Amino acid sequence: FDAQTGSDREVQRILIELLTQMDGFDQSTNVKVIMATNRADTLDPALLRPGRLDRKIEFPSLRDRRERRLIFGTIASKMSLAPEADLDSLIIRNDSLSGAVIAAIMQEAGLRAVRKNRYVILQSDLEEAYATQVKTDNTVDKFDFYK
Amino acid sequence: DEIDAVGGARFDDGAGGDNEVQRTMLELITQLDGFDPRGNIKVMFATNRPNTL
Amino acid sequence: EVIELPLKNPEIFQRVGIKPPKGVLLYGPPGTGKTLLAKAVAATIGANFIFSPASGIVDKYIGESARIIREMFAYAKEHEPCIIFMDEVDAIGGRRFSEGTSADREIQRTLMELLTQMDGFDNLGQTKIIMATNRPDTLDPALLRPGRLDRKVEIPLPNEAGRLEIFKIHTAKVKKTGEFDFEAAVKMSDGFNGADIRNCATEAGFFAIRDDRDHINPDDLMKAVRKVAEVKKLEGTIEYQK
Amino acid sequence: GYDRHITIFSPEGRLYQVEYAFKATNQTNINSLAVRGKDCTVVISQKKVPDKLLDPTTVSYIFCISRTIGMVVNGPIPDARNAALRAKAEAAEFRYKYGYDMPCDVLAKRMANLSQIYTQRAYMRPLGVILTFVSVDEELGPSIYKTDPAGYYVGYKATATGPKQQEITTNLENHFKKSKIDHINEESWEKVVEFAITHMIDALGTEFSKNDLEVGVATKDKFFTLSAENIEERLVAIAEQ
Amino acid sequence: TDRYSFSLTTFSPSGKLGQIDYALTAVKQGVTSLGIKATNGVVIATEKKSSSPLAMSETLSKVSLLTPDIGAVYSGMGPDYRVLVDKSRKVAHTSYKRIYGEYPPTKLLVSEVAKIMQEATQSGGVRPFGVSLLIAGHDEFNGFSLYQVDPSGSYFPWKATAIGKGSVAAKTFLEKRWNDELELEDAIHIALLTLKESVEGEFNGDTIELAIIGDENPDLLGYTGIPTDKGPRFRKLTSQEINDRLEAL
Amino acid sequence: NNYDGDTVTFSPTGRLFQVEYALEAIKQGSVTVGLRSNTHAVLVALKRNADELSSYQKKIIKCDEHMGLSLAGLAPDARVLSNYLRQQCNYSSLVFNRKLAVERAGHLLCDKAQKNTQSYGGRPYGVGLLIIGYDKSGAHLLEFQPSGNVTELYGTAIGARSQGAKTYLERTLDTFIKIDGNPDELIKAGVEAISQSLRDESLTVDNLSIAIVGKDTPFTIYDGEAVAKYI
Amino acid sequence: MSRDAPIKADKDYSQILKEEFPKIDSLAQNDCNSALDQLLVLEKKTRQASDLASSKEVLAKIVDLLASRNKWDDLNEQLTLLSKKHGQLKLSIQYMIQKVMEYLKSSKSLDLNTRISVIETIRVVTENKIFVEVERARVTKDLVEIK
Amino acid sequence: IGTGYDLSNSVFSPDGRNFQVEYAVKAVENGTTSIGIKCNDGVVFAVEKLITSKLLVPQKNVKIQVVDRHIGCVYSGLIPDGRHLVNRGREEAASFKKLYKTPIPIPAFADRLGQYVQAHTLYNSVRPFGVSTIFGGVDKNGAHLYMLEPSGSYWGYKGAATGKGRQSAKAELEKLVDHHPEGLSAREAVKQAAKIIYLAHEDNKEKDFELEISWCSLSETNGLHKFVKGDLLQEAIDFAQKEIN
Amino acid sequence: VDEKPTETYSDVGGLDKQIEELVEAIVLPMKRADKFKDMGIRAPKGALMYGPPGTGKTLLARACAAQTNATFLKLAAPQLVQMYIGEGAKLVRDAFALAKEKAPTIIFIDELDAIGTKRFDSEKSGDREVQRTMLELLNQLDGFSSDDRVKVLAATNRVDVLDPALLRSGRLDRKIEFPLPSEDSRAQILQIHSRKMTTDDDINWQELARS
């Protein structure tokens, strides 16, 4: 906090008010506030000490190959797939790929199918569409002289 | 007096830029010639380094 | 594929069994026509079209700035199908910071809302967002995020084909003696963008104020291409895209 | 303050100075696509010629370095001629001291070492060019070796260069997956020129006229460049495909 | 010209030599490589890596023969290895193959390449090499021996070790699986097993370059009938041969 | 700003600044005026003492038996280049038995000053010479700029208040070219030229140093009471 | 697709080819492939109007093929080839193909021939889902009747 | 981003550009107009040589120097720096003449200078040249014409130009090549070099100028580089007056 | 404007070509607004004046004020930046809104390094107060706003430091360079200041110009 602007002073008041009454919410039949943040280096540690927020859940952006194949598999069961397509060709390509990017990738493959005028998602579509929404080369791009 | 502060030569650096120092310096410059005649105002600069200017 | 189709027929997306896309991010080097592309599609599609500079919704006042933004989608839903168009979302879609000042931390309060407004538990029916940006690199990672915005259209610099088309769009309109110099000019005019082309027509036209000709010479076209080229290169080159 | 201003290491273990060369390569906007035929190697490249006043015969990015080794240059044209001169020279020297014409493999490693030394000086600027050396060897057959400003190189089944080369890499990779044979096959070199030109017309989404192409083919015991007159006879040959 | 005759490795103020520290960062960016010393061989191992599949791996090399009795394998920068392999072959001929007529012992050659290291941690206009090498070999009086030559210019004799991005996890696996009798065939099963946990990309006999410094093969000697000399002890394993031992996991 | 430290660093104005700086050494320098006709060249220099006890510093260096140069910059810098000109004038007499052309001698001079200004750890030479001589195409007056640049003029000046001298030469331009054979008159026309570059310092028999070269007169330096007829 | 040259003229050029149609018929007897070439060389013109005009002729040869009892195979392969190249437009062809299906009905061929022929026709419209979809169900009910 | 990147030249800037050498194109921008018309039988150089004072000696200064007997070299920008680049190619050409006893080809000579300017950009210790040259001549392989940028870039040319009036020149040379895209005469091209120096004198119409013209032509000069002087030079002058009227 | 002192074009001594280039982009589309409509081309959206300091870019604008007799909105770029959140942006939109009304218009901006540049992305700080007020400037130059009755005259003595989005022909169409006086032009300058104080005719102006 800068702690001289009104914008900041008003959030100071909120932050103490939530925290105080979180202790008030103790010994109730209620399970206390669930809250999420895509960031985590920006939070005050006064929330993060025991007796307020207790359980800290980790979510990775890494997945192992058995756990990856499952995400592609549930989304693809909801859509239609050619008997000429497979999902085990899709997961070897990346070593790192978070669960939502899999969702969008699956979208792309089915969007591409409208262009081609296809009911099914043939693997051809699927492969081309896979490479779209990957990107992120800046250390393997032209920078293989670090291996 | 002493415009080693508020006198840094303008450069681009990608950290934040020299924006706070030069904001003040550029206000000054425009009122030392106007876009209209300035009144009777004599201005004395005094510096230790005419090289940060 | 994203804007016309699920408005007309979401029955197409239903065949495959897949969700319709919403959220388009357009990004490009400047003068590639990214603002132009949206202006053109707003008069065609024939739904309600909210036009929104991203930098006129931020007030002084404390979270009024967020109050406007929530309303903007709540209006949209109620006029559905509707389109929310945001220009230059570097302004309030900036990087995370949280080591800034009070001014920048304000930006976090408006951004955090707009992120939840797009996807939460609240779903959007046929509300579609086209955001335009001059760099996807200095936008927030949470915004940029796959699934937050769906289709990621690159707007490239006009290809060897494209150059000819653009030159013809601005030259049909003018008075001229008859210009057959585009065969030379497209060749000369490499490393340009759409805005500089549109300027070459204006520039050729200013040589004819001097000649007192009421027609633009094809000779005047050769000069224009050069006049634009030199100044452009010198004063600063243009952005590269990831 | 001085770690990204000579080729010394940074707190990261990276050499940014070496890295800026790789960001200079793609500022010329010249594309290249190179495939190994059955008994030839064909490389096709753009030849942008901006102004009317350039004499087009002189504009080139195919350099003859030997009878068997051509060298195709992407990156600025000053750095191109200095890498090209050093190459011809080393080719002569090899012939001189070892008594056979230089094999490509060896020229690839030779220009690589000179690249390596240029990033371990402090008074030498690494040449910012990606050179692709195309050949037909009598021991290792048609090859492609691509060197780069750092001093790494690897052989290639095909390779592309330029700023739109991400696109070109995609077409060629699909092609060699589907077929399942590492090199393109077709006996006559003329028709590998045809297949190669189609793949550049598909990838870049642009057609090419005779002055926009400049094509080099290394066949057996000779490297030639096709005259722009002869390149049209190939452009017509795509009209019956 | 040259006016760069001042060292760019300089003492840092709280101690340490800053360039050599930095260069060791650049070692741990690169591929993962390991070596296991048996009682009758040394095995060395590395993973190939390309820009795209369009690169060939057939013409690529990352394990090189310095002398027929002494091989090397690196983890760190590709460019620096490439020149330093060639300088290693050069000093090995010029300073023991013209003077004592034969290939140098493993202790001696290691000591020479550490001095090549040393004269780019010092002198002007130069920074440190950005590799760390295992230089494994066999000499007639110190047995099989595995070394690690580093950006500092030190050497350490080892019995099994690993270098590269998966170094931390690799050596703990190797500490617990080491034993004071291994055969060379038993050594291989350790090295492959470990290198499989550091790969997450594709695994094949074409993408793992594996080398043994076993025992003598007269089929690579090139000739027969001088029994005084005994063929390459160094023998790089072909893709077909490696693949069987992969199934053997 | 930071562009001024060395001789290698351009410069956003198209310049290099250090050569620009060395050109200001000529300006703080004393005046010498050259004028030529079609038959005799004249250098008219104003010598400069420090104090009353002091001597006056030689401003005209006879370079050869038909060449003389005059400094208007650094005295140490003038000594280096003068040797170099003598050397190449003597190398021409020895090898080709040829009086070194005046037009050629500006090109030899040229390149000695360029090669230290392109180089690191060198500097430009901050001295401008006016070089007279009489060769095979007649009288010549060269102005050597510390920029390296050589130009051939009918009359020039360099120094301080020098502009006032160019003007005297600029008026009297169509007169002096036409008087030939009469060295008395050229000399006087050059004394009056350098007198409009005064500002309370005057001219005397220890300030004025004249040297001429003619068709019919080899290189002569007049000083003392031999510049007492020609005030 | 569309072009600014073969609108009116080329429609009149297909009317010239129709006066040359009996020469084509007489040529079809000696080798069917020789007759077939002229109608395919006409279908290399981009324009919707001229596309519809040209293909009538191709369907008119496809009665000749269907009439003969060893030439019925050829038309199946051709229509495979028509989907695969690009046709010349994707509006034109989908209608013309139905006329082929129509002909299958009224030809009264050997039962052996009819079975194979309807399988070859359906294989083409397997991944597709536009106009084609409707047609496909129309020939499959008829194929299912034979079985 | 980091501060530096303009104090040397074997730095690259973070965008892969130079500095000094990009700064060096602005040194060349202050220079005198200089054009080259490639005719079928040779080259015609012409250069605006300013009379900057009334105290200069007319027709006794030149900026067109011959290298060997058949390659004219003509430069603009830093004039002393420019003589040094010509001087290097007189040593290089002379070495070629001894070793192989033929006059150095225009493509061979282009190659020899080119390296030289490029070599000064590879060190932090030598200042990159701030001149652009137009050079060509007639050799056994025909006529060729080259412009060599300060960047150590050169290309073939049918007309090239440099200096301040490069804007008007480049535009006026497109017209001459659209009058005669099938070639033009070397006698004729003297007169056109005159006309395109006087139209390009309009960025620089403050002052007065001497036109210097030279040609190397196969059919009037026998493929040797000589100066355009006497009556022919005065015809071209009278030509230019009547055009600008 | 309240009428800024007339300098005419006898106190913009020398630099003819710049006055010519400037009046074409700013003064003709006002007066001769009919002739470009006929030619079917569009008028500029602006001119930029850049060069070394002291070359009278500010002088030429002051002149231009007196000559066109339309509303001239004087602007200094650090005045626009404001410490209350996006009230710097309120200043952009209002000033330009104002220019629609009082049309035809000229906005003269002095400086442009206080709307700085767009290059910041580093976690530690940034200043995204400067960026926002700049990105608002661009949205007024865009097609949905007026631009055919609002000319923007921009003057700066750094041009390198600027972000490419202010630049490009079509935001600021003209890229006018100011050089320093020529030999003859220096003479012209000196003689136009000297009318204000006493002189004698010994003074030869030529000598002074040479110096």
Ligand SMILES: Nc1ncnc2c1ncn2[C@@H]1O[C@H](COP(=O)(O)OP(=O)(O)OP(=O)(O)O)[C@@H](O)[C@H]1O
């Ligand atoms: N793609 C294009 N085809 C045709 N005209 C174009 C194109 N791009 C730009 N132009 C022309 O140039 C004008 C100016 O471009 P415009 O201002 O729309 O660019 P932008 O890329 O959206 O800008 P900014 O980066 O400032 O947001 C257009 O109004 C149009 O006349």
Ligand SMILES: Nc1ncnc2c1ncn2[C@@H]1O[C@H](COP(=O)(O)OP(=O)(O)OP(=O)(O)O)[C@@H](O)[C@H]1O
């Ligand atoms: N060409 C000129 N003719 C007449 N007077 C001039 C000329 N150039 C400049 N001046 C005078 O010099 C004074 C100071 O220059 P001014 O501040 O106008 O320059 P600028 O280059 O627009 O500067 P900055 O970018 O530093 O604000 C002017 O007010 C004017 O009186």
Ligand SMILES: [Mg+2]
């Ligand atoms: Mg100012």
Ligand SMILES: [Mg+2]
């Ligand atoms: Mg916009």
